[PDB]
């Protein structure tokens, strides 16, 4: 629920870590729709199956799980081997540990139709190969990743992945957004309050609080006499609360006695109105 685009998003996130001498590498995969996790897979888990993590995804037949469980496992084998292929490209030993991550997914517009596609890899936290935003060309950072870029241009991989991205990918995302309407299309506006902690009798930290909102996209801003005090405002990363919502605060350092010249502003999708909060 991209407030700028009208768009929703499906994303899968995959992390594989090699364990020299402690068994085959560990594969963790998670799927999200917008800001809701709905699916998970742990190679070290006993179930050895794709597992639900959202209540609306349990409404799914056996052929769904047998088939998703099949693909995610096919993925684990394929990135395990790529850990060796990549280790051989950079001329490094089997003694040290390495992290290979993947991400792929698609975005739907307000139209309900395909808008955006993603298919990206990253070795040891550093962008390795990536499908350009047009889905017709690749980007390779290392010289080593360019070996894959020509092998994949010569195997015509971009066209088929675009088929998954314009195909199953948008179809899955549309179906999830309907099945979990009461979750994914329902906006939780933030609860707003603010607090005063005197740091001296000279100065003072004024903190604006937003709790229990969804989606996680939010904007908090401070204003002195109606000007943005971007400088002296402290902003924390949006954080998860565990109930499916998110929290975020903004605090500014204010001369004591002038608290009323300071205004807090909350822009969030779940408000029919940007809020204004005074200390008052």
């Amino acid at each position: 629920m991209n407030s700028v685009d009208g768009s929703h998003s499906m994303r899968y996130f995959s992390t594989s870590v090699s364990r020299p001498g402690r068994g085959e590498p560990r594969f963790i995969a998670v799927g999200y729709v917008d800001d809701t996790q709905f699916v998970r897979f742990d190679s070290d888990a006993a179930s050895q199956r794709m597992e639900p993590r959202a209540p609306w995804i349990e409404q799914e037949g056996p052929e769904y799980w047998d088939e998703e469980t099949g693909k995610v496992k096919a993925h684990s084998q394929t990135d395990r081997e790529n850990l060796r292929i990549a280790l051989r490209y950079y001329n490094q030993s089997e003694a040290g540990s390495h992290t290979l991550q993947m991400m792929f997914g698609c975005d739907v517009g307000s139209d309900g139709r395909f808008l955006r596609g993603y298919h990206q890899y990253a070795y040891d936290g550093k962008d390795y190969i990536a499908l350009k935003e047009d889905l017709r060309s690749w980007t390779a950072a290392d010289m080593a990743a360019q070996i894959t870029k020509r092998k994949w241009e010569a195997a015509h991989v971009a066209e088929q992945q675009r088929a998954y991205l314009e195909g199953t990918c948008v179809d899955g995302l549309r179906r999830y957004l309907e099945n979990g309407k009461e979750t994914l299309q329902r906006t939780d506006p933030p609860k707003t309050h603010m607090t005063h902690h005197p740091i001296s009798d000279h100065e003072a930290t004024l903190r604006c609080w937003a709790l229990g909102f969804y989606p996680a996209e939010i904007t908090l801003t401070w204003q002195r006499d109606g000007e943005d005090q971007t400088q002296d405002t402290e902003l924390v990363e949006t954080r998860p609360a565990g109930d499916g919502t998110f929290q975020k605060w903004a605090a500014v350092v204010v001369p004591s006695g002038e608290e009323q010249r300071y205004t807090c502003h909350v822009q969030h999708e779940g408000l029919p109105k940007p809020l204004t909060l005074r200390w008052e």
Binding site: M10, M50, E81, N82, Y89, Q161, T168, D171
Partner: peptide, 9 residues
Amino acid sequence: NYNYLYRLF
């Protein structure tokens, strides 16, 4: 709906 195309480096 997970990806179904798997390729080597």
